[PDB]
Design a protein around this ligand. Structure first.
Ligand SMILES: CCCCCC/C=C/CCCCCCCC(=O)O[C@H](COC(=O)CCCCCCCCCCC/C=C\CCCCCCCC)COP(=O)(O)OCC[N+](C)(C)C
Ligand SMILES: CCCCCC/C=C\CCCCCCCC(=O)O[C@H](COC(=O)CCCCCCCCCCC/C=C/CCCCCCCC)COP(=O)(O)OCC[N+](C)(C)C
Ligand SMILES: CCCCCC/C=C\CCCCCCCC(=O)O[C@H](COC(=O)CCCCCCCCCCC/C=C/CCCCCCCC)COP(=O)(O)OCC[N+](C)(C)C
Ligand SMILES: CCCCCC/C=C\CCCCCCCC(=O)O[C@H](COC(=O)CCCCCCCCCCC/C=C\CCCCCCCC)COP(=O)(O)OCC[N+](C)(C)C
Ligand SMILES: CCCCCC/C=C\CCCCCCCC(=O)O[C@H](COC(=O)CCCCCCCCCCC/C=C\CCCCCCCC)COP(=O)(O)OCC[N+](C)(C)C
Ligand SMILES: CCCCCC/C=C\CCCCCCCC(=O)O[C@H](COC(=O)CCCCCCCCCCC/C=C\CCCCCCCC)COP(=O)(O)OCC[N+](C)(C)C
Ligand SMILES: CCCCCC/C=C\CCCCCCCC(=O)O[C@H](COC(=O)CCCCCCCCCCC/C=C\CCCCCCCC)COP(=O)(O)OCC[N+](C)(C)C
Ligand SMILES: CCCCCC/C=C\CCCCCCCC(=O)O[C@H](COC(=O)CCCCCCCCCCC/C=C\CCCCCCCC)COP(=O)(O)OCC[N+](C)(C)C
Ligand SMILES: CCCCCC/C=C\CCCCCCCC(=O)O[C@H](COC(=O)CCCCCCCCCCC/C=C\CCCCCCCC)COP(=O)(O)OCC[N+](C)(C)C
Ligand SMILES: CCCCCC/C=C\CCCCCCCC(=O)O[C@H](COC(=O)CCCCCCCCCCC/C=C\CCCCCCCC)COP(=O)(O)OCC[N+](C)(C)C
Ligand SMILES: CCCCCC/C=C\CCCCCCCC(=O)O[C@H](COC(=O)CCCCCCCCCCC/C=C\CCCCCCCC)COP(=O)(O)OCC[N+](C)(C)C
Ligand code: NA
Ligand code: NA
Ligand code: NA
Lengths: 189, 413, 177
């Protein structure tokens, strides 16, 4: 794969707390690397692009998403692997490809706020993945027509295109087409 | 074997979390990335290819038919049978069907080219008559084959409530008949008696009607061939009962009015010595519609005759044979859900019979599963269990952090 | 008709009957007839093909069994008593007529075993007219009660697909009108 200390810690997470990540990045600094260590993607053809931050949110650990962003790691790394691929190619879970699109597609609001409203580098909602699909294109992808799914899909759907208007006061995000030519409404249809 | 679902379920989906006793588990969690996880079932006893006694051969053969469909409609069992059907169960079944249909073509051609002169037509003396002999030898094989396979079944799997048992209970009985008649017809065709034909002619019609056996490869036709057998029980035998009372009643009543032929040679006006017999057929034709009243003045009281025919036609075509249609509708709406459940047993019994017919090295080649290092057995010994994956999705049970064997989620092929 | 072959007709005759049966296409303008032309197509699938399957097994079985009893015409010119070279063929039709009802048994003494012949016809008539063709009626009732709700939903797609096809065929200034 290319796995490193910092992924391995977060996979092997003790009740939402692995005390090693504050340490390894201290030693990472005193030799010197943060924008090469945290960012280090799995160079597989199956976890391609995945980083420690893509792992920090799927484990549902908020405390380190602050930490990984506190050093300015990345919030637009694209998990393009065959795993990070829809269930129409030979994959399992397509959330889009971005950490923002992940947190929205996992019913985790507080990070979706944080990655937008934080001190450090912000994740904008206009960023397209490798198929044009923004966060709202992705919520239409992970959605099913069950009861609990359509609950947080609509909430996190609403939460963002409202938030897109208080942020960039221009074309709504729902207008952003993709690399097939479709919008989130035409993508749901 | 006893039909205890509630505990049978609970065993197969036994998730134990505390790692001192995780080895007492049969549902594992191989990986879980976000809201998608792979559950991994223990097929230690279920799918044992040959060597050990199995849960799956017990549900399907010697169990309680009242709950098999609920015991086969749980965790991996159903997925496990579909995983056998696509490998070998489908194919080998569709070789069994073409081989049978051909054998009945081969049994068709002989009877059509079987001569009809003299003693049983032994003399062949041509090529075509040797081609026919190939059809009679291939035939007699089918008879003795279905004979031996059903008698070894009498020492082994056989004898549930036969012919009220829609899981090959009836067809076992009918292939056995077909096995006899091909042996009887070959005996009389070789003993010199010339009624080899009549017995052979019943065998032919069973065998094409025994090709309904092979309607299990599709829910459509398999659900069809069991309603036929249910609408032949809770339906058209009840009809045959009363219909034989109305018919003997009138057939005796109406021929009682016809005058004898001693009075003189002409039957179709008169009564003598086969009147009843032919007259039942004319009444069988009337109820169904392909007859003609053919009203008769030869009777002594002609008006009372037609009072009785019109009651036959009302109480048999307008009342019973149309009620016969209506009871089916009350049947096929009720036995539909049963019929989808009986097919799942038929279909499953088909697979395990094909599987059971293979050698153990070939069953052990078409295994439905995989060795996985599911945990340590408290001695360092890794537990290598033959298991079965089931991808599953849940957007509500977010804390899936219990038993993640493979920390790297995906199967990473 | 232009190459000189004279079977333009036979092919033309199949075209004619499709086209009038393709006028069921235009039953979409009413929920009545559009719901009707799709049940016809469902009762032709989860219904009368299953019937054609077994009915061809009962029929080949008996048609081969009953003609096996008739004596050849080498024995001599008269078919309707005897067996020769189109016996099977015509005899299937006489069995197709029996199941549906527009036939006559036309019971035959020319066979070598006459009594066993009528034992088999009566089983054909019971297991095909009294059992299957009436069960065929009963399965439809189980169908048309189940595919009714589906059928009202499929019409709404048929009906909608009809509109957008007409609309799509217009120029943009006329759509925009
Ligand atoms: C591997 C997964 C494949 C998935 C893709 C789909 C594949 C489909 C292949 C289907 C094969 C089965 C059909 C063949 C005919 C057949 O099986 O006919 C059967 C019986 O035939 C035999 O007895 C013949 C013995 C040989 C059979 C296997 C030949 C095929 C072998 C090749 C397949 C590949 C694997 C192994 C080859 C060896 C090397 C090791 C591999 C690993 C890598 C090296 C008919 O049933 P019958 O007894 O009449 O019914 C039962 C009667 N009753 C009990 C109901 C009354
Ligand atoms: C449990 C299975 C075992 C069955 C037991 C019966 C076995 C054998 C009996 C045969 C011996 C009797 C004949 C010998 C004497 C003889 O020769 O008698 C002949 C006439 O005799 C016959 O015609 C005998 C008719 C046989 C049929 C019996 C029923 C067969 C089985 C019925 C059950 C299966 C149904 C299937 C139908 C489908 C529908 C339902 C499906 C189920 C529901 C879907 C005399 O004439 P002749 O020309 O002179 O003969 C030559 C004599 N000569 C001149 C050479 C001396
Ligand atoms: C995929 C579509 C394409 C179809 C492929 C077939 C096309 C073409 C075949 C035609 C060429 C063969 C004839 C040439 C030889 C000839 O000439 O042969 C003739 C006799 O030949 C025929 O009769 C040919 C019958 C054709 C019908 C085929 C089926 C047509 C399509 C069937 C499907 C549609 C069903 C609809 C029915 C409704 C129910 C269901 C609706 C659906 C459910 C609701 C010989 O006699 P002669 O007088 O001597 O001829 C003159 C010769 N001479 C003396 C001049 C040299
Ligand atoms: C004695 C020599 C005989 C030579 C071989 C003759 C043909 C054998 C068929 C076996 C080859 C595979 C095709 C059948 C399997 C199949 O398609 O099974 C069924 C559907 O089947 C049919 O509707 C076959 C209708 C009647 C067929 C002819 C019989 C003779 C009638 C005349 C579903 O697919 P299944 O594979 O089971 O599903 C898993 C496949 N999945 C998704 C993993 C790729
Ligand atoms: C990719 C796969 C590779 C393998 C390829 C196939 C390999 C080998 C094929 C071997 C053929 C023979 C197998 C026999 C299996 C068998 O014993 O079958 C029996 C069926 O009775 C027989 O067979 C009778 C015995 C005499 C043989 C048949 C006639 C003579 C040979 C004819 C072969 C020619 C074929 C076809 C020519 C026409 C073709 C049109 C294609 C069209 C494709 C659409 C299974 O009954 P049972 O399960 O026991 O269920 C019965 C009911 N009960 C007892 C369980 C309640
Ligand atoms: C549990 C299922 C029901 C049990 C089986 C029922 C059997 C019914 C058939 C009874 C025979 C009817 C005709 C009379 C005999 C006849 O007509 O001829 C007999 C032929 O005897 C049979 O074939 C009797 C077979 C009995 C067991 C069934 C087959 C095997 C299966 C066993 C059942 C399980 C021959 O002597 P014959 O011709 O009078 O003179 C010539 C003497 N020579 C030339 C042969 C030396
Ligand atoms: C538990 C009950 C058991 C009782 C069984 C008793 C049956 C029969 C024994 C008596 C018959 C003996 C033979 C008759 C004499 C003879 O040889 O007569 C022959 C003709 O042929 C017959 O007469 C035999 C056909 C039937 C006749 C009517 C009886 C009908 C019996 C019906 C039985 C019904 C069962 C059941 C009901 C249906 C529902 C299912 C049950 C309940 C649930 C399971 C000679 O005529 P010919 O010389 O031409 O006479 C001419 C006279 N002329 C012109 C001079 C005046
Ligand atoms: C509940 C069902 C059973 C009811 C039965 C009770 C009713 C009637 C039975 C008694 C009839 C007696 C007839 C007379 C006796 C006889 O037959 O006299 C014959 C001739 O007769 C006649 O000329 C009678 C004229 C026609 C009227 C018939 C009756 C009325 C008809 C309407 C009936 C309606 C109800 C019912 C039918 C519909 C049923 C479906 C419901 C549902 C069922 C469950 C004797 O010849 P001759 O005088 O020598 O010949 C003429 C003189 N010449 C010219 C030769 C010298
Ligand atoms: C996907 C749907 C199925 C594909 C189309 C199936 C076609 C079936 C018809 C095949 C022809 C049957 C009769 C034999 C030919 C015949 O009898 O006459 C042929 C006529 O040939 C045809 O019309 C073949 C048309 C084929 C494509 C379909 C139509 C176009 C649509 C294409 C399909 C999509 C003429 O030469 P000939 O008369 O022997 O000698 C006289 C020579 N001269 C005077 C003409 C120079
Ligand atoms: C997968 C199975 C594939 C097997 C296909 C094999 C079919 C046919 C090949 C063999 C026929 C070759 C021609 C015969 C010779 C000939 O030319 O005979 C002609 C007569 O015409 C025939 O005999 C041909 C009509 C049919 C005959 C019976 C066979 C029935 C075949 C039925 C096939 C059933 C399929 C399927 C079942 C239904 C359910 C759906 C399936 C399952 C799901 C999809 C010459 O008579 P003549 O000289 O006058 O003889 C007189 C003799 N006398 C008087 C001297 C004694
Ligand atoms: C489960 C369905 C299949 C059952 C089949 C098994 C039953 C019977 C088959 C065997 C019959 C054998 C008949 C004798 C052999 C034969 O044919 O002998 C012939 C003549 O015969 C007779 O005189 C036999 C008298 C009539 C009684 C027939 C049988 C009893 C009839 C009632 C059957 C009831 C059950 C069933 C029918 C209703 C079915 C609907 C249910 C539902 C279906 C699913 C040989 O001529 P010859 O002696 O030379 O000519 C006369 C002598 N002279 C004057 C020329 C010198
Ligand atoms: Na009629
Ligand atoms: Na009629
Ligand atoms: Na009805």
């Amino acid at each position: 794969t290319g796995k490193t200390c910092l992924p391995k810690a977060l996979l092997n997470l003790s009740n939402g707390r692995n005390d090693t990540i504050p340490v390894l990045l201290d030693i990472a600094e005193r030799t010197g690397n943060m924008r090469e260590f945290i960012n280090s993607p799995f160079r597989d053809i199956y976890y391609r692009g995945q980083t420690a931050l893509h792992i920090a949110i799927e484990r549902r650990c908020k405390h380190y998403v602050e930490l990984l962003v506190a050093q300015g790691a990345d919030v637009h790394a694209q998990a393009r692997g065959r795993f990070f691929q829809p269930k129409d190619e030979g994959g399992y879970f397509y959330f889009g490809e971005l950490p923002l699109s992940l947190a929205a597609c996992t019913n985790q609001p507080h990070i979706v706020n944080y990655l937008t409203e934080n001190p450090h580098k912000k994740a904008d909602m206009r960023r397209q993945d490798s198929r044009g699909n923004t966060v709202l294109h992705a919520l239409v992808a992970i959605a099913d027509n069950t009861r609990e799914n359509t609950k947080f899909v609509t909430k996190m759907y609403d939460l963002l295109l409202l938030k897109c208007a208080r942020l960039f006061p221009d074309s709504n995000l729902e207008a952003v087409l993709n690399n097939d030519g479709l919008s989130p409404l035409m993508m749901a249809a | 074997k006893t039909g205890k679902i509630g505990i049978f379920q609970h065993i197969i989906r036994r998730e134990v979390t505390d790692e001192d006793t995780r080895h007492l588990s049969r549902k594992f969690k191989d990986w879980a990335y976000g809201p998608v996880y792979s559950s991994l079932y223990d097929l230690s006893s279920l799918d044992t290819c040959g060597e050990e006694a199995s849960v799956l051969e017990i549900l399907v053969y010697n169990s309680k038919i009242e709950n098999r469909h609920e015991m086969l409609a749980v965790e991996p069992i159903n997925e496990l049978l579909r995983d056998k059907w696509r490998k070998f169960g489908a194919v080998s079944f569709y070789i069994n069907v073409v081989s049978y249909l051909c054998a009945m073509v081969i049994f068709t051609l002989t009877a059509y080219y079987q001569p009809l002169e003299g003693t049983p037509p032994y003399p062949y003396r041509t090529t075509v008559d040797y081609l026919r002999l190939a059809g009679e030898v291939i035939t007699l094989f089918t008879g003795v084959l279905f004979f031996f396979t059903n008698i070894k079944d009498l020492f082994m799997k056989k004898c549930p409530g036969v012919n009220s048992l829609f899981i090959d209970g009836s067809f076992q009985l009918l292939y056995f008949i077909y096995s006899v008649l091909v042996i009887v017809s070959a005996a009389l065709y070789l003993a010199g008696i010339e009624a080899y034909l009549a017995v052979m002619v019943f065998a032919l019609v069973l065998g094409w009607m025994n090709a309904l056996y092979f309607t299990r490869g599709l829910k459509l036709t398999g659900t069809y061939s069991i309603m036929i057998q249910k609408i032949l029980f809770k339906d058209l035998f009840r009809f045959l009962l009363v219909y034989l009372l109305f018919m003997i009643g009138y057939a005796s009543a109406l021929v009682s009015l016809l005058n004898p032929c001693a009075n003189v040679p002409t039957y179709p006006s008169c009564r003598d010595s086969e009147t009843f017999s032919t007259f039942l057929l004319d009444l069988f034709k009337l109820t169904i519609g392909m007859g003609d009243l053919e009203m008769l003045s030869s009777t002594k009281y002609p008006v009372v005759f037609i009072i009785l025919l019109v009651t036959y036609i009302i109480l048999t075509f307008v009342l019973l044979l149309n009620m016969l249609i209506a009871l089916m509708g009350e049947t096929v709406g009720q036995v539909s859900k049963e019929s989808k459940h009986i097919w799942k047993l038929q279909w499953a019994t088909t697979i395990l019979d094909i599987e059971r017919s293979f050698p153990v090295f070939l069953r052990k080649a078409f295994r439905s599963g995989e060795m996985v290092t599911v945990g340590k057995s408290s001695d360092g010994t890794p537990d290598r269990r033959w298991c079965f994956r089931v991808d599953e999705v849940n957007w509500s049970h977010w804390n899936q952090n219990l038993g993640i064997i493979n920390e790297d989620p995906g199967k990473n092929e």
